[model samples]
Target: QNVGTQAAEEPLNLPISVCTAPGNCQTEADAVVLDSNWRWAHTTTGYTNCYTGNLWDTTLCPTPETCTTNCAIDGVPLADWSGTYGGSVTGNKFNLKFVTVGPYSTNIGARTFLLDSTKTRYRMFQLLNREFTYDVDVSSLDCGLNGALYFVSMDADGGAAKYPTNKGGAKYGTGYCDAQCPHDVKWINGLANSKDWTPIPGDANSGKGYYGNCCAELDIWEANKQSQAFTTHPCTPNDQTRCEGVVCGDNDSGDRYNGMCDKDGCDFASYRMNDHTFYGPGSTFKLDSTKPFTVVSQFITTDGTDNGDFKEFRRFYVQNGVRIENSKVNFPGITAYDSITDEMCAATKGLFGDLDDHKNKGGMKQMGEAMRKGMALVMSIWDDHDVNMLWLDSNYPPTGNPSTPGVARGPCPTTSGVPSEVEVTQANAVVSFGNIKFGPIGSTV
Candidate 1:
């Protein structure tokens, strides 16, 4: 591990450099740019920064509050067991490859690349516009697998203060909250089999009840709790009613129970920016397996205020470095918390008491607090067989099988008897991420 603090005053005009090993890649660029002096860290275990049998154990680290298991300079690599390298840096870009060598199962064969503490400090600063750019290739991903690139903000003390308590001395309702912490914006590609399996007819892009397929999705969350559960309990055809007592495959229900949605069914706290209609099934803006694509998300605050509120947010895509624009698809523009709260409350028919109470309690303000804390960038890939509905369309069937229509609901067959393998033509499944760049929204390179 490369310990100690490095000066953050490097000029932003220096040529970029890349790191092929576990160390910092120093370049002439602002701290906002992820490639401009970032350390690379990884782990083969299911945990994000830890090893097996020691998940979230802080006692093993020199800094108990910031203990990330097996992510040190001497951390274990994916090649330890699989012989092939899982991560490498070439030229000015970082590449990550996930090669499936066995059967597809929940959380199996998962690999992650975590930005080191120095990079994480970028988010600690306040009142700034931020943009992230990356070119991604998912051509080799199987229909059953998916990938994610996102930014998240956690308590500086690693949840030591516990829930409902902000570790960084950030108070709730003053641009922060303890209950719904770890704010983030997650951009996903490949197959979306979990909460995005069903389409919301009431959505702005929902032209019809069932117009799109389950594919790409982007969501903003004030708290990571609900999003975590959405993947944890993979809703299968056999257990279609609910995944852990909550309705399975429905984004609304997942949000409601997970604290993103109020009891009145109002979604004022979280935003599922991309519904199926925009990027998933039946949409022209699909993620082609044969080409590379880029997704950009920009967050701008109102006049550099410390009120911890975003002035507006937008997400768009590019193919071959050219912007991909479609009339049918639209990006979010200057959104106001008051407007979203009013709209969501009017759409749902549940009791308005809870909705009114949430508004009065400064729900949106709390979301702003989490947002202001900044986020740690994350990239990962995984597969889900139980909820194959997210990947399989009625028109396209899995290899060696007939059309399995409409979200396959269980009474599911035994694992031994079921056809659960992802039909992959490519012998080696891989996904690559170009260099990640972040800075002021309109700043030029």
Candidate 2:
């Protein structure tokens, strides 16, 4: 008799890079300051889907006025070029750091990361078309970083007229094509058979098989061949939830089924990415004072649309398996007008004092207090199935095009919730708090 068994499973949660603090280096917060450059705005061109649809579709931006030097095609905005920062290299390995902006939101708007010549895959975060820069430098690396950015999109619902197949260009049906291919379509990839729902390629179809979303070409072939794939859930025909695949990973029909696809089923919402954990507050604490790493602070704002607050919610969690604590910031703020102004003014705020003196006593304290209130609430509401970290607004850098007016909305609320005893007593506790502090003076008053 012959018997076979599975191989030993490796630790699912482990830090990809090691962080250290050398002379002149400070704690994570001291080494890096969350910049105020992060901001969001609509494109000067209207009607263009800011975060969905065929990236090459010229139909979305019918008006010639919407075109810009930054754009490669119509209906696509070539605006907003603020890149991210932080993460270091040790030996030959390169470590990229990324923070969560919360879950994906189609109606409300979310910050999508795009890749540029400097960065190969234009749209690496959320499935959108917009360029985002990485903060840390990687001049001396041997190989490139390997990972896929994940987020919920409108296509998650199988019933949406332009479901995954439509966006994926893998739709299947009769001769009456839903939307004719702008480029040739490839039915079979290598020897692998196309799924029943895969789209047929166009004759001159240079577009099919590429991973580019509405923002940039996504090389699906490379993603699948190399094992880099976004995880998504499936949705029902009816739109009862309204939030659907784009926000909560489920159609409003309730949690009766899991409607996700791709490797591991969910990639965009991982606790690990870039260098930090998306939901954890205290998890970012420094273990070695001598070797300081960078800490990234992300903020998500929600105005509670007519559908109530469910339309928007922000929360964060700890990096599991890594040596860290579970503390997140969730809070509302003054008004958009005030929050924007305060953030701008705070941008000039310098770094923490010297490593030995730790001069920015007030600054460091304020950061802690703000995280306690702000991140605590954020971590509380982050529902892997409902509320997402990508929805956070302040995480992205600020845009400076006066031609594009900023969005108008209610002031962000900075309230925190109390955790239940059982919740507080859990072996691994995920705590929620009240209104958090926003700026440099967060911890003070």
| Shift in Å, residue 241, candidate 2 | 20
Per-model TM-score, in order, reads 0.46, 0.21
The alpha-carbon lDDT assigned to residue 302 of candidate 2 equals 29
Among all windows of 10 consecutive residues in model 1, the one with the lowest summed lDDT is: 225-234
Off by over 4 Å in 1: 1-74, 77-85, 100-107, 111-113, 117-128, 156-289, 302-308, 326-365, 389-420, 423-427
Model 1 residue 123 CA deviation (Å) reads: 7.0
* Per-residue C-alpha lDDT of model 2 across residues 1-445, encoded as one tens digit per residue: 0001211111111112112221221111101111011212123233332212212334422322222211221111111111122222233223332222223411111112212122211211221111111111211211111122222221211122332222111011001101111111111111111112123222111222221111001111001000111211212221112222332222233422232111111112111112123222232332221121222222222231221111111112222223332222111331221111122223211111102111111222222222222110000011111211111211111222212222100111111111122112221211111111122111111
Candidates' C-alpha lDDT: 0.31, 0.18
Backbone clashes under 3 angstroms, per model: 11, 101
* Model 1 clash tally, residue pairs: 11
